[PDB]
Amino acid sequence: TTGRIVAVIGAVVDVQFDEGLPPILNALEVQGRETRLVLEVAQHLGESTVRTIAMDGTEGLVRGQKVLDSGAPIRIPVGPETLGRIMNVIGEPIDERGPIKTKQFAAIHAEAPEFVEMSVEQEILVTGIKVVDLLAPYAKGGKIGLFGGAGVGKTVLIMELINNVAKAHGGYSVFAGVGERTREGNDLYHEMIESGVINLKDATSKVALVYGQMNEPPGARARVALTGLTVAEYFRDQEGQDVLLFIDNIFRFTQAGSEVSALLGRIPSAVGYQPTLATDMGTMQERITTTKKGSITSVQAIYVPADDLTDPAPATTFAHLDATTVLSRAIAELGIYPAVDPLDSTSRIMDPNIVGSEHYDVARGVQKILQDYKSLQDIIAILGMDELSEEDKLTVSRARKIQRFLSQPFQVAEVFTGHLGKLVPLKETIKGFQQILAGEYDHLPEQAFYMVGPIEEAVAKADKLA
Amino acid sequence: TGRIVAVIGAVVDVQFDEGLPPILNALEVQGRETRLVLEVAQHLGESTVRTIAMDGTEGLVRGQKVLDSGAPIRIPVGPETLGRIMNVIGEPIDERGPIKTKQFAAIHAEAPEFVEMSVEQEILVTGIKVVDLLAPYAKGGKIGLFGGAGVGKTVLIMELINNVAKAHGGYSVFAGVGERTREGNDLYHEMIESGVINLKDATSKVALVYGQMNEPPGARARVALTGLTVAEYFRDQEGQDVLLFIDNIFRFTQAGSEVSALLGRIPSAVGYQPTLATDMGTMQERITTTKKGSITSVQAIYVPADDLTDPAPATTFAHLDATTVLSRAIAELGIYPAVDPLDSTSRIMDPNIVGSEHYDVARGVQKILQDYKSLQDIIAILGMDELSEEDKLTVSRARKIQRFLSQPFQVAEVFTGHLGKLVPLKETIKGFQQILAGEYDHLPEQAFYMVGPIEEAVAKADKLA
Amino acid sequence: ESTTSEQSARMTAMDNASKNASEMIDKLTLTFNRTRQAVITKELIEIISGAAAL
Amino acid sequence: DLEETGRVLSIGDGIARVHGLRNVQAEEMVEFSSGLKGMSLNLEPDNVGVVVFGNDKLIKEGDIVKRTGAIVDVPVGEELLGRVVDALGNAIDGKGPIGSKARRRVGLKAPGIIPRISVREPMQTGIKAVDSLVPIGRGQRELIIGDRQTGKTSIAIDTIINQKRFNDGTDEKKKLYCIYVAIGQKRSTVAQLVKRLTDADAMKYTIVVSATASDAAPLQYLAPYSGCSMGEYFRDNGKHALIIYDDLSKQAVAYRQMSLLLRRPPGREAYPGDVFYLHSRLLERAAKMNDAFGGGSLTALPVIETQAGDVSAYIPTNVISITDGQIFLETELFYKGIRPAINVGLSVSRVGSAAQTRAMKQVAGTMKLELAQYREVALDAATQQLLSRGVRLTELLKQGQYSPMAIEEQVAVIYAGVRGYLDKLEPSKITKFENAFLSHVISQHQALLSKIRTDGKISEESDAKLKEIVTNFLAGFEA
Amino acid sequence: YFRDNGKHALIIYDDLSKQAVAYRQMSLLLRRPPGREAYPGDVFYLHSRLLERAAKMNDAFGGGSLTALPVIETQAGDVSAYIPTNVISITDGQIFLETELFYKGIRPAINVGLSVSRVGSAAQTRAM
Amino acid sequence: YFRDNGKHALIIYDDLSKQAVAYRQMSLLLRRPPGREAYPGDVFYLHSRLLERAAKMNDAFGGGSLTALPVIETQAGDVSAYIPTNVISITDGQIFLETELFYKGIRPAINVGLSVSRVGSAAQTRAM
């Protein structure tokens, strides 16, 4: 049936229906507009009125304007025909290549997989990135999160991961841009056409793109992660297959939720966030998961408001992850890239029974020396190095080199560094740090360990200078 | 004729049957022994306005009659305000009878438009050596006066008044915003002793507007505007350069915060009003140079918690063209005025504005004092004869430089027993330049201490010993 | 000889210690004032929410 | 007629509440009887909430409100060049009507992925420290960030003045139209700024949009969107524009004032949850267009003021997370005399090498690295020589105000330092060397500078020529 | 059911931080006014009434018992926080874990100095 | 009454911290908008109108006086708290007392460095 608009404020529109009240989540179509304007039903207010969230701008809307119930949630193209294409929140092609001729559609709202559907398979996913592989390794089919404040390296890292892991993976990828830069979307698209992972001729494309960036109103930014996840869900289930899912940036989903909560009528919670922060997040995150039907390896970039990891948004996100990589501004300001905090990054598979006792012992040995060094710094900060014993002077020496050896040049960062990107095998990362811990390189300067790959490149860099 | 429908502290709601008073209009409550003015703040709907009371609301009754005056608060303007004290609503509070003025003026005037602006920066010569050389004031500018009590703050304000009228002829207005009553009385009498106010004739150089600490926030919030209004008559109708003192800006902001809370507005960061920057902006922007003349404003600034990032000083700082920093340490050294020559700043300290000669000397005097600071951190640790041959030369000159920064004031003559000096900018420059050039290394330091022009620095040495 | 060397070196170490402390003080004072303001702001938003909800 | 007209119910609580206007659109411009304009923000069953673009105190209960039928828009086009306008696009310079023939919606969504292409043309500032270390490309967003009085506006103004050299010439791809948006500043300051631009002959290619300190908050809110729309006219018609938002800190506090009066729930520093989006939608509109959309670009330089160097604050981190880089100015570097007070460590261009002449990569491609390394550490081995290089290079990057340098003059200066010629020199003397050296290569070696410019590279014949210039110059002066 | 039918049970609440958050959502959306940190006014009671149900029963009631190990997540080590302080004040003792200790190699990362348990029956063991 | 009739009175307010708390109770329960520390906006004005009534009258008005000794309790010595801030800004000076001085044997525990009388010398006999 058809409704009439009775109120408009930003993204939130009230609609009165004389007959047939549309269920919550149903997509409504506004009549009399140049491009499709969907309103998603959020609440039944009473008196045959629904409160809804707009998926595009609401300028030009008039009280009285007619609205049509589609009789279902927002539904999008899913299937192989999405690969190499770009879709917006509501599944429309935005790449000027015509219709997405899929044989199926799917609603963007779905029940999270049940407890019975869960898998417990733990298998290492080698990244070629020293800090990650060594201290907090990723798992195939696991949930990975990249935490960072403004401009610390989340996107550079996610793009390195796409470059390093997607090739080795033998299946399909989905990239969802949520509330990020439109030009990063343009860069990514054209780089994939150049490399061939997107093909504009054949059916050989291996990546599906879904975008709703920071130019978009909040309804779109809140829903678009669901659009991308729905595409990944099809590949996981209708194929039974291994999917990679990349999201930059999942924070923007929560932020967009707070902008509309403001107008939905809800009493605010801590720091002005929607009272439903943790449940909204859970309903979304629990679908981003491997099941018994197939595997999703997911990598999500996670913004940290004002560098505060205790902010409700990042704080609530940790519980959803199997591996976490935490980036630190302070570590970046030591010029260490990637700016991973070795004392704040964790993984479920960092277990001697899974990675081996050797990998494990070395990882813990590195963390122990970095923590011991951290403890000396309040004393050093004031009293300087001369108050330390000769054994503590060596812990400081070995720790500063270990800090620097965890740094690495990235293929994708050559535009900023002026250095060739490096990929380091796990066995070489293990051996490399194990030797520094043993004091096998106590004779080299610190700066020889900065921005190199395997350990043999430190020895070489040390001989470059006299 | 409106009728009171609600009273809650300093907030009064009034219903009008036909002639609804526009926002900012002054209303006069009928049947009260002293004048009670309500300023319209909002139109609530259903022919009702919300207003802010300019005095206490005790004894108000619902149904009590209220007259719309037809305009904003209007106050006396003109020469007859000089030497007088008025309150926010322009009544005399000095018990000297009516302020018999030939014109009145509304206190909520608009700031001059963009076309009315002077394209050029220009110097306001105070006659004070520290200020004029290192941190000069601009005509049409706002100056931040920093420092608490016992630092010669009242004597500096009075000297600025005295010197501006002495040299340029222009007048001063002093808005006491949220001051202690005892201190308003002290200032009034300190002004009579100095002669900036004269109760016997027409030679008073200042007009006073007082909005005391114990008045409602609506009154304390508008005091600065009342003073601005008095000032604006002199600038516009008399074509002058006027000086507006505001003591102090923190309390102007504080009262704005209280008015906003009374109106039940959701507070912003650190408790301040949402309109913090617009409140400030609508007031500060009336202090400018126009074609008819200029208003220059010296504003005492209190910094809560010593925190310069506190929204109140932070918002004010955006409007300032110079800072004058008064310090106890400088006073303890025996230097008056107690201006910190290194912490004071001025935006017009640019070769294109003050001249090439001014900038060089000032930057040269600034450097040698900075040298003297680093050289004094070696004597205390080690000793005097631990420094080189050129080191003792920079010390000797810098000691005479800080002494030639000190100045006897005309307004301080009644107490210390020494005659005060007004020094032109040209004599300040060439005097300081001669110390840096070394032309007075053969003279003792005490000759440079507490004098006017460099001609006194030469002559004082002859009198001594 | 040793004592002269030791006292001079003690002077320097204490000088460095107090310069390092002053730098930390400066940095902590900034964090202090930021945090101070943020606590007032946070508290007040809670009371305002509590009032609006009634 | 209550379909096309309405009457004010209440005023003085921020937004005006209006009865009627049954046919009014959301975001439609409306007219008050006092001559003010407003924007229909809130469409409610019983009222329209109207944001007033002026002094709301001029509005009374019962006043007549009229529909315009148009979503908020502004005058756009080349008639605005050389003009000073307020936030609504009306003249405030006293020179009469603008004469515009076109208009654009202020709230128009930024171009999507497809209409764009990667930035590749230099946007030249003429400031050594920027063009070498933080190069801007046409269609980029680059934040200028620092405390009060650290030189933010000066970077912007020297950038505008620098374009005269291109705008007077022939090479049409190189022309750049400028828009300076002043938000929350004093009128005296804005007038001094248009004076300087007029003195430099920069006004003829510049539009000034001003919503100042005594202008109502909604005007300060609107100003950047209005300026941006004027920039977009160039962007979409095959031309290149540069926009300065000075500053977005002041825009955000006007929006916080509006949001608090609307009783939106405040978060950190009492800002509403949509402050990020306030700036993200604006800054997304600076873009480089692909050729199918005409090839134009709009470049943005937003300005943010930090408090006591706190770049981890809410509004600063929001904008950092929006723009394609930042130029961080620091008080400590500033009042020490290092001007422009660029912290070469923290300052990044998220585009980098992509939009820079080859000759600059050949010098700055090593200078950039040698300065974040230097910052960290602020007889010994290579650790100390990092400090020796870092001090020389820092001094080499100093530059006086209004002292534009062409890219070829910049590479020659950077060359002298980066190759280690001044390494034997004393840091104090670096400034004097640069001024005499530059004016000498300008006097007789216009052939060399010409060769580096046209070739866009330091060729082997240029490399050996310059090497002979610096070596012979280095020795031969009075000290 | 075990406690009251002569048997012994151990219960782990993992974790009570997340239960308080859910309670806060529900209560706010019921339009019950937000208290400290937007939590309901009776968040203390939410936890105190639960944990008081762990008990040791006398023989006339069956001699059974229920032991509780609630779990609380702190933020950046802040035990002085609202919910953490509530539960500390309820429990008989607490096992404090710390990140510093964890990374130093102290695993389990128990802070022995701060960690407390109530005496112990004489019976923890005897050779222990 | 004493001030206006040519006499001299001294008044002690012990203490104004407790008076502001009571005023805050009334104001909040009247649902007046709350501010910093939940004190209403007019809490400054509460204390300013009270303390400005202490005055020294000239001979033409009888010569009398009222002297006020308000007492404020600080918490952990924080003079930047809302109510102590207000009162310090109103009065002509403060006598500041400290627990550290008290236990050191400085009794009365007056911190002379932090104490001031802005009237100062004018209120002393020549001998003193």
Ligand SMILES: Nc1ncnc2c1ncn2[C@@H]1O[C@H](COP(=O)(O)OP(=O)(O)OP(=O)(O)O)[C@@H](O)[C@H]1O
């Ligand atoms: N390269 C430079 N060399 C010398 N002086 C400079 C330079 N750049 C800026 N200045 C000076 O620094 C002062 C502050 O500059 P500017 O107004 O650009 O800073 P700002 O951060 O925008 O200040 P505001 O807080 O007033 O907006 C000005 O007086 C200017 O002349």
Ligand SMILES: Nc1ncnc2c1ncn2[C@@H]1O[C@H](COP(=O)(O)OP(=O)(O)O)[C@@H](O)[C@H]1O
């Ligand atoms: N691995 C890296 N190597 C070198 N530079 C880096 C690296 N990661 C980040 N950066 C620097 O930081 C900037 C911002 O990184 P980005 O990932 O875009 O930040 P954000 O965390 O905001 O997404 C980059 O443009 C680059 O200058």
Ligand SMILES: [Mg+2]
């Ligand atoms: Mg990113």
Ligand SMILES: [Mg+2]
């Ligand atoms: Mg500026």
